[PDB]
Nucleic acid binder design. Structure first.
Lengths: 454, 454
RNA sequence: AAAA
């Protein structure tokens, strides 16, 4: 269930041209046909604006004719039968306009000095919110129920093109555009660029930034596959020396680092900090050279066809420099606490703030394993447990409650004979939220300042 | 540090108009100058695609001398100054165009048939990947170091406009477009449009979808503020009846639901399930009328300039219907297990899988509190603990491994002097991923099935 | 609305 979405434009200027995507040249005056036969979708839909044509009965019927009224020039038959197929639906538009009125079922023609040619009407000055048009297009898209979404662009106002792109973006649409200026001419060869990646590359960079910001490892889009298929043909010494470094950027380490944080592996997450500090330092001076090459693109037409390269994918990976600090593994964990607080991952933040003072004390008592067999641990954990339990009574409750979550001796639900579990305690969203985000840091520093003189 | 950016086009055709931005007016011909005089940015970076210059001297300065040669045609004197210090950064382009040759600095003009014009030898044809142009624009944006990013898409090819939008999207730019489309004429009036709304509305819907997909409330963009401020001055009662329902959609419940799932409060998360069943069922209808309203936008011209209502923000909230199941609170939790497995939130999945069979057995006993005082719990927890520790030795280990976390008696790290920590057990990143995602479900059913026998 |  493939379906082609076609943004409309002024047909009274369209010159004949031949298109080229994966070879298979087809020629006409508009993309809609060239792309129809190329992809062979189940149903093509025409997205026409209000500021384009206007008549007493079917403005919708005027477009179906106006496109054949232009297909008639050069006796172009492969259009009359293609118009029985495409469904024409009207969309709103913004701005001053030169429209084209219809007397009835055919476009009207005004013989004013030049000769019998189409007429103009400018009183359309519609003040609309872009979100309104977006909503109107979103509805027409949603009310189609397609498996695959393919949207021909190239035509339409720069505003509606921008709007339609964002609507399509939601329906995981494949975007195509035939870039051609004025006076293209007969038998001209025009590529039909696929912008899908450019879109699902901008999204990736926002997901990569969110992945860092909220310490997640499922928001990060692993571009190691794109980087794996690199090393393109015509390569100059200086570009290949930089690119071969970039090609081998250990991105899977940054993923593992975020994983060991989301799943709470500070021991390994904090240890990796120094390695990543070297990864990003190299990724900075690599991207700086790439930024230079792309800032002088006129000399790097080998990167000409690079669909497997994205500066935004790399620059967004640079954000991890924030999640990195310097110092001993203990000092690095102290920072990791604050990262668990800024990202609202409470469960890990409390657990870390609970066990860090054990480790702090172990360091000042000569150090010792986190095993119950170790006496320097055993006693040292009792110092932090007992100090916490008589002072920060809340730190202990909040930690344990979040650790076992639902169905625990901490929450005491009744379960019921019927099976309708009924909770025992409440502890609202903004109970935990206030504690972690406002006191958990202040309280921690007060604990460590106590264990300092230990 | 505000700075404007604009996809530059064919200035040779550009006609004078009177631009309108929420009160302030401006009388300029080309788009950029109107916004420059308005927002008064610190910088104005530009330069066209390579598809309109090929002069022997500076390809850049040529645009500087032709833009002003169009300013001289009309009655003007103040577009050579304050516009002289504009940053001209050249960009690549795709397809077939007609690129104005240009002499040493100013353009090269010739006459064929007509009295005088600028000779169109203009043979532009370049095969480029859209990602290349995106990279080239990205580098220009990054190498500007602006505080605020402002971007024009009033002009340019539909391809470069799409590209520039995605590049701007990352610098969280404010997007503006002056929709004209044709023959504005002398003293033309054009009320500009801000598309910034549409962009950070498409992003919001993708964030809302992943918020659901990965059970994380942090990704959800709370539109209750937009809905709070939804007070159109004049709207029809039918329109009124639907929107006044939508206005009061309590979205904060869906947020709280996701917060409980993310923090492990399955008790309260599972109970809210049918309240939410009712919430989405209500938004499944009106959404239906909103999508019928917007599919026949010509009727409800009242939301003509309503930049507050959004359909994608609501439709993406309907995704939560997946997270919802019907049945007793026990079998709702059984589903919640699979939701903790599908989203790779392991820690909660195992804790739920370990503690669910305690509740299952309690129901078989007629129900009991999950308090250590309760004998029906005490013994019944020992049945599940002993059965687990005797067969699913792995379930118990992994569960404490995700519960206590790195710094723990479960990981046994060393920590010596100078704050250095060395792990005791290597993290089994894939041993967790494979166990939870392949065995935990099968294992759970084998325990519950055994419990069902007694 | 094939660089308004």
């Amino acid at each position: 269930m493939k379906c082609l979405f076609y943004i409309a434009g002024d047909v009274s200027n369209y010159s004949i041209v031949n298109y080229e995507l994966n070879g298979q040249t087809q020629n006409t005056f508009f993309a809609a046909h060239a792309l129809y036969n190329l992809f062979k979708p189940d149903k093509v839909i025409a997205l026409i604006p209000d500021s384009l044509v206007k008549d007493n009965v079917s403005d919708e019927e005027c477009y179906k004719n106006l496109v054949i009224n232009r297909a008639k020039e050069l006796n172009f038959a492969g259009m009359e039968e293609f118009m029985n197929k495409v469904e024409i639906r009207k969309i709103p538009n913004v701005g001053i306009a030169s429209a084209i009125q219809c007397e009835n079922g055919a476009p009207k023609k005004e013989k004013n000095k030049e000769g019998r040619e189409v007429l103009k009407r400018l009183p359309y000055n519609e003040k609309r919110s872009p979100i309104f048009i977006f909503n109107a297009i979103y509805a027409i898209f949603k009310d189609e129920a397609c498996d695959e979404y393919l949207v021909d662009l190239t035509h339409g106002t720069n505003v509606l093109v921008s709007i339609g792109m964002n609507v399509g973006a939601l329906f995981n649409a494949k975007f195509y555009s035939a870039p051609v200026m004025g006076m293209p001419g007969k038998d001209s060869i025009v590529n039909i660029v696929e912008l899908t990646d450019v879109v699902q590359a901008t999204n990736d960079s926002l997901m990569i930034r969110s992945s860092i910001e909220n310490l997640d490892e499922r928001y990060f889009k692993d571009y190691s596959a794109k980087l794996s298929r690199l090393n393109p043909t015509i390569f100059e010494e200086e570009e290949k020396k930089v690119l071969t470094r970039v090609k081998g950027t250990d991105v899977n380490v940054v993923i593992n680092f975020l994983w060991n944080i989301r799943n709470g592996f500070t021991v390994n997450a904090v240890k990796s900090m120094n390695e990543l500090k070297n990864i990003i330092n190299q990724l900075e001076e690599d991207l700086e050279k790439l930024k230079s090459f792309y800032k002088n693109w006129e000399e790097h037409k080998n990167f000409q066809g690079e669909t497997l390269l994205v500066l935004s994918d790399l620059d967004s990976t640079l954000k991890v420099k924030d999640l990195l600090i310097e110092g001993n593994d203990l000092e690095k964990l102290n920072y990791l606490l604050d990262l668990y607080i800024k990202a609202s991952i409470y469960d890990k933040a409390l657990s870390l703030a609970r066990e860090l003072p054990v480790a702090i004390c172990l360091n000042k008592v000569g150090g010792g394993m986190f095993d119950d067999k170790n006496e320097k641990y055993k006693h040292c954990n009792e110092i932090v447990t007992s100090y916490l339990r008589l002072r920060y009574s809340g730190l202990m409750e909040f930690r344990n409650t979040l650790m076992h979550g639902g169905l625990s001796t901490d929450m005491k639900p009744n379960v019921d004979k019927d099976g309708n579990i009924t909770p025992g305690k409440i502890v609202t969203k903004n109970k935990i939220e206030d504690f972690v985000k406002r006191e958990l840091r202040n309280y921690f520093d007060k604990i460590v300042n106590f264990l300092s003189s230990a």
